[PDB]
Every structure is written in structure tokens, then in C-alpha cells.
Amino acid sequence: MKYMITSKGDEKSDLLRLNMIAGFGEYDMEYDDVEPEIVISIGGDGTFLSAFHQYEERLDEIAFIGIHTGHLGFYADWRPAEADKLVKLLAKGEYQKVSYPLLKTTVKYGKEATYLALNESTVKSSGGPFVVDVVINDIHFERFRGDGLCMSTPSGTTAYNKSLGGALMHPSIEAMQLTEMASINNRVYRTIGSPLVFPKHHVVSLQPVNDKDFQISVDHLSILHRDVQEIRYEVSAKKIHFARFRSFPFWRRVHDSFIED
Amino acid sequence: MKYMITSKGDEKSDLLRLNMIAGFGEYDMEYDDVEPEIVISIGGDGTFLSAFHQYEERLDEIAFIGIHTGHLGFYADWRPAEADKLVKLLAKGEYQKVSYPLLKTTVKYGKEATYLALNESTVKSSGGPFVVDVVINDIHFERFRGDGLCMSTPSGTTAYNKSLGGALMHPSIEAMQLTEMASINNRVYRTIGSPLVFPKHHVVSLQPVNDKDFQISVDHLSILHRDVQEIRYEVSAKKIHFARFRSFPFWRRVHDSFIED
Amino acid sequence: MKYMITSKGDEKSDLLRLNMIAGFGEYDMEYDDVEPEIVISIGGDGTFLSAFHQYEERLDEIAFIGIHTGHLGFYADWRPAEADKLVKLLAKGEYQKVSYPLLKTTVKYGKEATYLALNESTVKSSGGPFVVDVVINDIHFERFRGDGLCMSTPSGTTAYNKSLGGALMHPSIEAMQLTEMASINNRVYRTIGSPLVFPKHHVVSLQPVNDKDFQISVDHLSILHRDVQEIRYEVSAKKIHFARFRSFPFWRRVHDSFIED
Amino acid sequence: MKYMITSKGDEKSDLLRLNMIAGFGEYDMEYDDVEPEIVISIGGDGTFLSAFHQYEERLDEIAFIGIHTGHLGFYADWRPAEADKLVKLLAKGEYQKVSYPLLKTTVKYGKEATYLALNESTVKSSGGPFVVDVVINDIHFERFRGDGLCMSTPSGTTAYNKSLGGALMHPSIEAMQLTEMASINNRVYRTIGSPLVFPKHHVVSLQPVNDKDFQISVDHLSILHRDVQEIRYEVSAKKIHFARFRSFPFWRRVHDSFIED
Ligand SMILES: [N-]=[N+]=NCCn1c(Br)nc2c(N)ncnc21
Ligand SMILES: [N-]=[N+]=NCCn1c(Br)nc2c(N)ncnc21
Ligand SMILES: [N-]=[N+]=NCCn1c(Br)nc2c(N)ncnc21
Ligand SMILES: [N-]=[N+]=NCCn1c(Br)nc2c(N)ncnc21
């Protein structure tokens, strides 16, 4: 069917892309980067994230596949030496697909904006102190003072969330995980400390107390938002779909990446 | 129907128990501690855990309810001042029920034994060093050296798991969470560090490397097991059922217990 | 002798300042904010930090004293109700003095700039990823990737350093403590993880790998430094001197602030 | 002078010991394991700890030296290939010496017993819950509930203390560091959380609240003490002395052990 290939841009990735395209030309496959049904990322997980966000409006019509030309990735989890075998099995079609949960972020002002994150969304202050009221399902949970907060997807738990002390969650669990950055705790200020794992349909709301300006990140992209009234997090109804061509279990991927490979 | 009441044993709890029994005698309610359909715990979460384990073979025929005569509990989450209202609404019946996941622990020797945990199960060494191989779905994940390991239920995440750095998980998520106790990490020994959240049907196996003797705990109970060949953890197919008589959200319960009340 | 009083600027602090000045006028005491020998801070620890930095060039000729008009401070550790007793004992003189270590920060470019910190100095990236080589006494220790790093004084260990997992150090120990902010660790990237306590004369150097632009903080002040070649940390040869008028042990101050008061 | 060599007991260590003894016989050196002035440990840091404790009553008359026949140690920090060079330079004498602080532990009953630790001393409960009152310089600091506590020397900070989140301290700092094991913290129970670094002459006292029986460890040795009234920790007045024959900086030793070698 229709497909496209994105590259990290170095010689290795660019030349691997041209060789899969050449390989694909031996099949009933059309290169189309406007309405593809297969998106191949060649590079690292950062290349994959840009591919995901490039096409985040046609997520239900696309199966993603990532090839790592550097170290192993959690999304770019196939080796360049399998490019030829990848071309053949993608061309034949009839491959199985796997879906990962996504994180929806809503930002409201005094209109509103929504974003999809594949890894995580983080909130920090614009320059001064960071204080927000944390509201879970319309109930006030805590007044957070610290460097910021991070809301992770399950597949995102191995990224920023891991550096902040969060748990690693198998991505078949539809959930989101909130971690703290450098919270201050004393006799007058109190945060939960522990990461928090929220299921589908639970809404976590961040509401300002003094400053209304926040640096908000979604995956790689970070933008200063001004006059913010609320930041809402919930597990998205949308999912990212991967082409599955063999078994590479999440826990094995965790092992290869953090234990030894 | 049939019901029983367990007490922590101090004057407060014993006298509250006699007064609910007296209140129950004004209804079509029979005291039966052999085959009850309602189990009322009066005391703390430790009293509730003993009630759960006293009847863990009739879990599907029992709705549990806990009253805290001391500080607020995560299972004993109703006040003594609501005992009278509790008697009336339990007697009428037609109350809603909520179910929490449980943790199954299997211990194999050279027969085997299974246990249900409501909070967590922990493994430590019998006296010397603790080293186990950690196997996830038959794939070797890591060689753990440290003080021990802990596998938590979702409702258990607010107990030992929280003291070890684990995440707090809403109990509607069918999962288990593995946390490390004082792992040694250097250039030659390597553990993941992060807590690990596993879904239903994932099997986590602990296999000895040298010493085969382990101190294994399940909730309050801890026993030295000898000549152990394997410890297997998985989310149980069984659930604990609570009588629900009003709204007391898990996150509110977390807030009241760790933030302020 | 000569003295000055700085205020946080709210009614409480401003009126307490005017009343100590009035009290001081009953003694051989001259108000001089150019060359004082006593600096009184009225407000919180943030007011005290500004006082310290206002006079950081005459540190050896000044004894500092802090009054907290809000919650208890680690530097502003005396109550407004003791202002009258403070005036009398400072005026008589012949009080004992206590000295706390300070942190020297050197920033080199392609000239150089030095700073004194009473609490801590932190380094973070200007916008992109933060990577520095960490060099201890001219030996390469690690390549740090993460959000940033923080170097604390002993009295500073109860501030940002505490939020990052560092140890609390009694301020009679001449040392500095380096803590990590959200380090990434995997099979290819490796940091020590643990806080690091360095003695006098040990030099810790931060050297850039790619980006040469850093956001560098010293206590309350944070400035983007451009074309940085090196950041050097060492325990300063200078100390901050406090007027001591009764016993308020550091550990008691830690207890009152974080346990209960 | 007089000297002795202890071995881990495997072929490698036993044969290296016999070859240094043979090498020493070419000099004015006498083997004496009763009153040696040089103690050579061949094996790992565990072999070194047993050597230290074997002679802990003649610490001021002994210079220790450790050889690692396995991986690098923090005390056994010389390679077997340097045994021949070690024999020659020890025999000539006139080597420099370095001293590390030690931890004194006092246990009082209803007599009393004192111990020296080179790494750390830990207190845990005998079987039930662990609760102690923590007293610093006769002032009540906190009521600790958890798995236990650990008091580390500076050179010990790279051992158990590191696994518990403590800081790594250069051993030229005369201090001790208290870390928590799995403390419970809620709205009713409160610990400091952070590691605590204490200077010389500060006394940290552990006093029981309910159970008076404790499992107390000092380095490798762990003994159940019964009817304990107090456990006192302070930096010892005694030090361990090493023979120094070249430069192997502590931070380099930390790097080789935890970063790469
Ligand atoms: N941190 N780090 N390494 C960068 C690669 N990285 C990205 Br980009 N996304 C992920 C992810 N989901 N899990 C683990 N590493 C990831
Ligand atoms: N730790 N502590 N406090 C004892 C009470 N405790 C018990 Br017993 N079970 C739980 C639970 N599931 N969550 C939170 N606290 C609990
Ligand atoms: N974080 N917080 N609270 C602000 C007050 N704060 C300041 Br400003 N300096 C210190 C210090 N040295 N120790 C503890 N708190 C401090
Ligand atoms: N943990 N671990 N590894 C055992 C070796 N070990 C001993 Br025994 N003593 C020390 C020490 N002082 N520092 C670092 N490792 C040490």
C-alpha cells in the first residue's frame, strides 16, 4: 500500500532509507508521505517521535515501525540488518498490529489546546517558583511546590519518568503515571512523594496558585504557555499502532536497554 | 443474611462489636462465623487483613467491610460513628460491591504451596546474602543482589511498597508491582532499580543461585521456607469484594492518610 | 557599633525594623548600611540570603543575625518576640560568634568570574540537553547526562540539596555536596547516582561536551552564561559569621523545621 | 619488621600468600601473627574486614594493606601483579601511612559492650516491628518506624550506605552517616528521610519504645542483642592505618568500581 520513510539525516540512515525504497519498488507499494498507511522511522527513538507527531492526525490508519541505526531503541527496536526482511514482510501485508496507550494534555486559557504525547508531558515554571494545586477527579489532592511534574504513558515510563523515580509499566496497561521533580517537603508543605498511576477516565488537573505562566513539554516539544488556567491530563482514547513482525517482548527490551545487550 | 464481626480486642473495638451485634438482632440477620456472607472488621487494617485471611477460601461469597477505631485505614475506612448507619444499610442488603485484585504466590520445593496476598509478598534471605535470578515470562531479566524484593497488589501499594519507592496504583488496575530492597549496583552487578508494574497473566519467577532457604512473607505472615526451587508471582484470578455504602474514593483515601485529615 | 537592618518589606517586618532601630537608639549604636559590623535580617531565609549577598565583600567584618517574621528559618532562626532581648545583647557586644563554610564557584570563558554561595550553586542547560564531563581533582569522574547538577554548602544541604536526595550535613563540617537532577542511566550512559561529599581543597570541575551555554544559579540568582569553558567548585576560604546569643542546635533546627514545632 | 598475611582461602589467594612469604624471606622480615606491624590481606574487602577485626586491639601499631585477587576492592585495592613490588617496598619500610575514621558502637543493657566498625553498624528488629526513638546529643530528634537504620563510616559509605541512598564521603572527613531502611511516613508517623552526616563528638542514641530486642550488625558480624536499653553511635577516637606505596585516589577508586574499569 502507501508508505513513507523518515530518516535521522546522517549518511547511515539516509542510505538505509534509499535502499528500502529501492527494495519496496519490487512490490505493489507506493511512496506517499501525505496519506501513508505505513510509517518507517530510521534512526533513534527521537526520529520515531517526530514521525509519530508528523502524522498524529491519522493514527488510526497507520502502522508504525522503527529501525535503530544507533543503539537499541524502545520504539526503534529493529536492526538495519533486518531491513530487507522488513521490506518483504511489510509488502506482503497481513502482519499483526499492537497498540500502545497515549496521553492527552489539555491546556486552558482565559481558548484551549489539546496535545497527544507518546512519551510524556511535563510542566515547569516560566522562571520563578513552581506551585500548582493538583486535582484528581475534581478533588483537591495536594499543593505541589518543586521543580515541576511529569505525566508519562506506559511506553514513556522508560524515558524521563524513569529518571524521576517512576515505575516501569508494561504498555498493555491503559494508564498514566505522575512523577515529581524535586518537591519541597517540610512541616508546612506536603506532597505525596510517590509516583501515582492513574487508570483510564481519571482526570488529573493542574491549577495555578500565583504565576499563570508555565513551560509545558509534550515529548520533544517545549513551549512557554501564558495565562494558563488549567492543565488537564487523561489517558487518550487514541492509540499508536505498530506493525508486528516477530516477538520482541517489552521486558526483554527493558533488559537489553538497561541490564546488558 | 449470615454475618460475623471480628475485633482488634481492645475495649473500644470489643464494645463496638457487641453494639453492632445488638443492632443486627433487630433484623433478619444471623451471626455465623463459619459461612458468613458479610465480614465486618473492627480495628485497623491489620485487623482487616486477619479477617481476609481467616476467610480467604470463601472470597467469592463474602463482602468485606472495615471500621477503624483508631486512625483511618485503607481497608478499615469507616468511622465508629457510622456503625448504626452501617447496620441498617447492610441489613436491608441491596448494596453495591467493589472488587480489588489479589496477588498469588507459588512456592515450589524439591511439593508446592500457594498463597493469596491482599497487600504484598516479600522474599528475603534466611541469614546470609540474598541473590536470586529474576525471570519474567520465562525470560531471564536480572540477577538481583540486595536485601530482598517485594511484590505488591494495587491496594497494597500504599503499604510496604510505598516505603520502598514504589508507585501508588489505583486498585481498579489489575496488576502487580515489584520493588527492590537495598540493591547493590556496581560495574559487575546490575539491577533495574525502578519499580516494575506487571499486568494480568505475566508470571514473575524468583530462582535461587546459591542458598535455597528464604524468609517469605505474605501480608502479616512470615515463614522461613527451606529448599526452595522457585517463587512465582502473578495477579490472582480471585478478587476481594467490599460492601460499598457511599463514595470514598481511593485518591481521597490516599490524601486523608498521607497529606492531611 | 555600626549596624544595619534589612526587611522583607511587608508591614510586619518593616514595623519590627523600626522598633529595633528605636531600641538601638538607647545605646552606643550607629546605623550604617555602608560599613556595618552587624547585619540584622528581618523576614525569612530569602531575606537573609539577600543580606548576605549585599555584603559578601565584608564577610570577615560582619556578624549576621536573622529574625523570622513568618515560619522558622535555618538562618532566620529567632522569633520577633525576642527582638527586644536581641537589641540589648547585641548592643552590649561581647557575644560569641559561629562560622559556616561557603561554596566558591568559578566560571571560565574564552575572562572568568567567581561567586560565593551560602546555600548552593546549580548548573543546567540553556534549553537543549545537559551533558557535562565531571572532573574531580583533574581526574575524569563521569559524563553526566540529565537535568543538571547542584553543589551545596553544609547549611545549604537543608534547601535544594534535600529535595534532590542529598544528605543533611552539620555545618561544622567543611565540605561541599554534589547532587544529581534526573540523571539518565542505561547500558551506554552511567552516572554515580549517589550524592558526593567533598572536603576542603578538592576541586570539582564541570566541562562542556557540546553546548557551551549554561543556566547557572548561585543561591537566589540565576543567569544564562554563554561560551562557558569550565565551572569549578570548591569550599571557599571565606566563612559567614553569625552572632550567637543562645543555644539553638542545628539538629534541633532540622527537627523543628521538618518533624514538628 | 613483624608481619602476617591472611588469605581468602582459595587456590589463587593461598598461592599468592606463600609467594609473598617466600619473597619476604629475602629481607629482615619476621612472620608473626600475634604482634605484627604489617597486616596483608589477600582476597577481597571481606577478607580485609576480617583482618581488621582480627587485630582491632592493636590498630595503632599496624599498617594494613589489601590485595584483590578478584575484582577491585575499596580496601583491597592492589593487583596480584604488584605483589613482588609490594614486598620490596614494605620490606625497606619508610613508607607513608594514611588513616581512615572508624565508628564506635556502644550497646547498653539492664552491662554494656563496645564495637569498632570499619564499614557500618546496622540495627533492625528481632522479628516484629522496628520502632526506636532517635536522640542526637541528648535531644529527641524523631521516632523511627521502618526496617532499620544504618550508621556508616566515610570509607563505609560505598557499601551498605550506598544501597540505602546515602552520600559517598571522602574518607578524610571525620564523620558518620545515618541512613534509613524503608521508613514509614504518613500523617501520624514522621521521619527525616534524608541521610544525616554527623561530625566528631556528636552522639546518636537509639532508644527502644516497645520491644527491647534488636538484631545489631557491625561490618560482617550480626548478633541478636536482648534487653537493650540504648545503642550509641559516635566517630571513634581510633583510626585504621594503611601503608601507602603509590597514589590511588578515593574518587578514582569510586570511578573504577562504579563507572568503568
Ligand atoms: N532517556 N533516554 N533515552 C532517549 C530515548 N528515548 C526516547 Br526519545 N523515548 C524513549 C522511551 N519511550 N523509552 C526510553 N528511552 C527513550
Ligand atoms: N504501613 N503502614 N501502615 C499500616 C496499615 N497498613 C496495612 Br496493615 N495495610 C495497608 C495498606 N494496604 N495501605 C496502607 N497502609 C496499610
Ligand atoms: N526549600 N525551602 N525553603 C526555603 C527556605 N530556605 C532558604 Br531561602 N535557604 C534554606 C536553607 N539553607 N535550608 C532550608 N531552607 C532554606
Ligand atoms: N556492597 N558491596 N560490595 C562488597 C565489598 N565491600 C565491602 Br565488604 N566493604 C566495602 C566498602 N567499604 N565499600 C564498597 N564495597 C565494599
PDB file of C-alpha atoms in Angstrom, chain B residues 124-258:
ATOM      1  CA  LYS B 124      14.496 -12.147  51.799  1.00  0.00           C
ATOM      2  CA  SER B 125      17.415 -14.403  52.663  1.00  0.00           C
ATOM      3  CA  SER B 126      17.448 -16.722  55.672  1.00  0.00           C
ATOM      4  CA  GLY B 127      20.584 -15.123  57.135  1.00  0.00           C
ATOM      5  CA  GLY B 128      23.308 -14.829  54.528  1.00  0.00           C
ATOM      6  CA  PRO B 129      23.325 -12.845  51.292  1.00  0.00           C
ATOM      7  CA  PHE B 130      20.216 -12.600  49.142  1.00  0.00           C
ATOM      8  CA  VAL B 131      20.787 -13.411  45.472  1.00  0.00           C
ATOM      9  CA  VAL B 132      18.040 -14.530  43.106  1.00  0.00           C
ATOM     10  CA  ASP B 133      17.650 -14.709  39.346  1.00  0.00           C
ATOM     11  CA  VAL B 134      14.559 -12.761  38.282  1.00  0.00           C
ATOM     12  CA  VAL B 135      12.642 -14.339  35.388  1.00  0.00           C
ATOM     13  CA  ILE B 136       9.741 -12.591  33.623  1.00  0.00           C
ATOM     14  CA  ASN B 137       7.567 -14.796  31.394  1.00  0.00           C
ATOM     15  CA  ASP B 138      10.363 -17.401  31.216  1.00  0.00           C
ATOM     16  CA  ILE B 139      12.956 -14.802  30.110  1.00  0.00           C
ATOM     17  CA  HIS B 140      15.874 -14.056  32.442  1.00  0.00           C
ATOM     18  CA  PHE B 141      15.595 -10.389  33.418  1.00  0.00           C
ATOM     19  CA  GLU B 142      18.260  -9.745  36.059  1.00  0.00           C
ATOM     20  CA  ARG B 143      20.388 -11.224  38.826  1.00  0.00           C
ATOM     21  CA  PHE B 144      19.278  -9.410  41.980  1.00  0.00           C
ATOM     22  CA  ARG B 145      21.622  -8.894  44.928  1.00  0.00           C
ATOM     23  CA  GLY B 146      20.273  -6.945  47.882  1.00  0.00           C
ATOM     24  CA  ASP B 147      18.134  -7.211  50.995  1.00  0.00           C
ATOM     25  CA  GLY B 148      15.098  -8.660  49.227  1.00  0.00           C
ATOM     26  CA  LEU B 149      12.175  -7.990  46.922  1.00  0.00           C
ATOM     27  CA  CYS B 150       8.513  -7.107  47.386  1.00  0.00           C
ATOM     28  CA  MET B 151       5.517  -7.804  45.128  1.00  0.00           C
ATOM     29  CA  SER B 152       2.531  -5.554  45.805  1.00  0.00           C
ATOM     30  CA  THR B 153      -1.134  -5.559  44.908  1.00  0.00           C
ATOM     31  CA  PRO B 154      -2.656  -2.237  43.816  1.00  0.00           C
ATOM     32  CA  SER B 155      -4.319  -1.659  47.186  1.00  0.00           C
ATOM     33  CA  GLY B 156      -1.065  -2.845  48.740  1.00  0.00           C
ATOM     34  CA  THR B 157       0.954  -0.138  47.004  1.00  0.00           C
ATOM     35  CA  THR B 158       0.188   2.239  49.906  1.00  0.00           C
ATOM     36  CA  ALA B 159       1.845  -0.137  52.421  1.00  0.00           C
ATOM     37  CA  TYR B 160       5.390  -1.644  52.292  1.00  0.00           C
ATOM     38  CA  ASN B 161       5.630  -0.866  48.557  1.00  0.00           C
ATOM     39  CA  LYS B 162       5.341   2.864  49.317  1.00  0.00           C
ATOM     40  CA  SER B 163       8.213   2.711  51.829  1.00  0.00           C
ATOM     41  CA  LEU B 164      10.415   1.139  49.116  1.00  0.00           C
ATOM     42  CA  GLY B 165       9.863   3.835  46.470  1.00  0.00           C
ATOM     43  CA  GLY B 166       7.082   2.143  44.513  1.00  0.00           C
ATOM     44  CA  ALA B 167       4.217   3.896  42.790  1.00  0.00           C
ATOM     45  CA  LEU B 168       0.708   4.223  44.200  1.00  0.00           C
ATOM     46  CA  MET B 169      -1.704   2.433  41.853  1.00  0.00           C
ATOM     47  CA  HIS B 170      -5.454   2.913  41.774  1.00  0.00           C
ATOM     48  CA  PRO B 171      -6.876  -0.518  42.710  1.00  0.00           C
ATOM     49  CA  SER B 172      -9.087  -0.733  39.607  1.00  0.00           C
ATOM     50  CA  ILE B 173      -5.906  -1.633  37.681  1.00  0.00           C
ATOM     51  CA  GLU B 174      -5.339  -5.399  37.545  1.00  0.00           C
ATOM     52  CA  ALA B 175      -1.589  -5.503  38.085  1.00  0.00           C
ATOM     53  CA  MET B 176       1.276  -6.230  40.460  1.00  0.00           C
ATOM     54  CA  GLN B 177       4.317  -4.126  41.312  1.00  0.00           C
ATOM     55  CA  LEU B 178       7.817  -5.386  42.131  1.00  0.00           C
ATOM     56  CA  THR B 179      10.087  -3.158  44.255  1.00  0.00           C
ATOM     57  CA  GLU B 180      13.710  -3.674  45.340  1.00  0.00           C
ATOM     58  CA  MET B 181      15.099  -3.571  48.895  1.00  0.00           C
ATOM     59  CA  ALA B 182      18.633  -2.132  49.028  1.00  0.00           C
ATOM     60  CA  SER B 183      20.003  -3.499  45.776  1.00  0.00           C
ATOM     61  CA  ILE B 184      23.746  -3.418  45.257  1.00  0.00           C
ATOM     62  CA  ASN B 185      24.753  -1.969  41.886  1.00  0.00           C
ATOM     63  CA  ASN B 186      28.305  -1.645  40.596  1.00  0.00           C
ATOM     64  CA  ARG B 187      30.295  -2.396  37.446  1.00  0.00           C
ATOM     65  CA  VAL B 188      29.797  -6.153  37.956  1.00  0.00           C
ATOM     66  CA  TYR B 189      26.283  -6.307  39.495  1.00  0.00           C
ATOM     67  CA  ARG B 190      23.274  -4.696  37.835  1.00  0.00           C
ATOM     68  CA  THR B 191      19.593  -4.376  38.743  1.00  0.00           C
ATOM     69  CA  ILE B 192      16.900  -2.299  37.066  1.00  0.00           C
ATOM     70  CA  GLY B 193      16.420  -0.067  40.111  1.00  0.00           C
ATOM     71  CA  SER B 194      12.964   1.099  39.059  1.00  0.00           C
ATOM     72  CA  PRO B 195       9.763  -0.483  40.380  1.00  0.00           C
ATOM     73  CA  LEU B 196       8.127  -2.773  37.819  1.00  0.00           C
ATOM     74  CA  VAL B 197       4.373  -2.897  37.100  1.00  0.00           C
ATOM     75  CA  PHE B 198       3.182  -6.198  35.594  1.00  0.00           C
ATOM     76  CA  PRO B 199      -0.268  -6.879  34.090  1.00  0.00           C
ATOM     77  CA  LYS B 200      -2.517  -9.901  34.496  1.00  0.00           C
ATOM     78  CA  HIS B 201      -1.082 -13.200  33.202  1.00  0.00           C
ATOM     79  CA  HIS B 202       2.552 -12.042  33.415  1.00  0.00           C
ATOM     80  CA  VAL B 203       4.479 -14.501  35.605  1.00  0.00           C
ATOM     81  CA  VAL B 204       7.480 -13.315  37.641  1.00  0.00           C
ATOM     82  CA  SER B 205       9.698 -16.125  38.917  1.00  0.00           C
ATOM     83  CA  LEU B 206      12.424 -15.939  41.572  1.00  0.00           C
ATOM     84  CA  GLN B 207      15.038 -18.659  41.248  1.00  0.00           C
ATOM     85  CA  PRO B 208      17.879 -19.266  43.723  1.00  0.00           C
ATOM     86  CA  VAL B 209      21.542 -19.145  42.758  1.00  0.00           C
ATOM     87  CA  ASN B 210      23.291 -20.428  45.906  1.00  0.00           C
ATOM     88  CA  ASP B 211      21.310 -20.601  49.136  1.00  0.00           C
ATOM     89  CA  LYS B 212      17.910 -22.247  48.693  1.00  0.00           C
ATOM     90  CA  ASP B 213      16.459 -21.018  52.027  1.00  0.00           C
ATOM     91  CA  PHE B 214      14.316 -17.867  52.095  1.00  0.00           C
ATOM     92  CA  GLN B 215      12.214 -15.854  54.551  1.00  0.00           C
ATOM     93  CA  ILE B 216       8.942 -15.368  52.660  1.00  0.00           C
ATOM     94  CA  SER B 217       6.178 -13.058  53.843  1.00  0.00           C
ATOM     95  CA  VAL B 218       2.559 -12.804  52.722  1.00  0.00           C
ATOM     96  CA  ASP B 219       0.868  -9.791  54.311  1.00  0.00           C
ATOM     97  CA  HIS B 220       1.423 -10.116  58.079  1.00  0.00           C
ATOM     98  CA  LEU B 221       2.689 -13.731  57.988  1.00  0.00           C
ATOM     99  CA  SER B 222       6.392 -14.545  57.526  1.00  0.00           C
ATOM    100  CA  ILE B 223       7.844 -18.064  57.406  1.00  0.00           C
ATOM    101  CA  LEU B 224      11.283 -19.496  56.690  1.00  0.00           C
ATOM    102  CA  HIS B 225      10.921 -21.765  53.652  1.00  0.00           C
ATOM    103  CA  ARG B 226      13.635 -24.369  53.122  1.00  0.00           C
ATOM    104  CA  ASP B 227      14.930 -25.991  49.921  1.00  0.00           C
ATOM    105  CA  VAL B 228      13.086 -23.549  47.667  1.00  0.00           C
ATOM    106  CA  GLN B 229      13.395 -24.109  43.923  1.00  0.00           C
ATOM    107  CA  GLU B 230      11.176 -21.267  42.706  1.00  0.00           C
ATOM    108  CA  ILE B 231       8.888 -18.456  43.850  1.00  0.00           C
ATOM    109  CA  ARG B 232       6.245 -17.473  41.285  1.00  0.00           C
ATOM    110  CA  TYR B 233       4.169 -14.278  41.364  1.00  0.00           C
ATOM    111  CA  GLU B 234       1.110 -13.455  39.282  1.00  0.00           C
ATOM    112  CA  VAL B 235      -2.082 -11.457  39.595  1.00  0.00           C
ATOM    113  CA  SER B 236      -4.627 -13.812  41.117  1.00  0.00           C
ATOM    114  CA  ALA B 237      -7.809 -14.818  39.324  1.00  0.00           C
ATOM    115  CA  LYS B 238      -9.589 -14.229  42.659  1.00  0.00           C
ATOM    116  CA  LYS B 239     -10.688 -10.841  43.987  1.00  0.00           C
ATOM    117  CA  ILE B 240     -11.691  -9.413  47.361  1.00  0.00           C
ATOM    118  CA  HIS B 241     -15.206  -7.968  47.421  1.00  0.00           C
ATOM    119  CA  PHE B 242     -16.211  -4.978  49.546  1.00  0.00           C
ATOM    120  CA  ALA B 243     -19.646  -3.789  50.518  1.00  0.00           C
ATOM    121  CA  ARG B 244     -19.994  -0.239  49.179  1.00  0.00           C
ATOM    122  CA  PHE B 245     -22.370   2.081  51.016  1.00  0.00           C
ATOM    123  CA  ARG B 246     -21.112   5.539  49.993  1.00  0.00           C
ATOM    124  CA  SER B 247     -18.365   7.240  47.992  1.00  0.00           C
ATOM    125  CA  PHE B 248     -14.866   7.236  49.499  1.00  0.00           C
ATOM    126  CA  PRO B 249     -12.508   7.495  46.514  1.00  0.00           C
ATOM    127  CA  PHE B 250      -9.107   5.795  46.676  1.00  0.00           C
ATOM    128  CA  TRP B 251      -7.304   9.053  45.913  1.00  0.00           C
ATOM    129  CA  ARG B 252      -9.247  10.833  48.656  1.00  0.00           C
ATOM    130  CA  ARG B 253      -8.262   7.965  50.967  1.00  0.00           C
ATOM    131  CA  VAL B 254      -4.629   8.474  49.919  1.00  0.00           C
ATOM    132  CA  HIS B 255      -4.996  12.207  50.576  1.00  0.00           C
ATOM    133  CA  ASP B 256      -6.577  11.807  54.019  1.00  0.00           C
ATOM    134  CA  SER B 257      -3.861   9.327  55.021  1.00  0.00           C
ATOM    135  CA  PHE B 258      -0.677  10.989  53.716  1.00  0.00           C
TER     136      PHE B 258
END
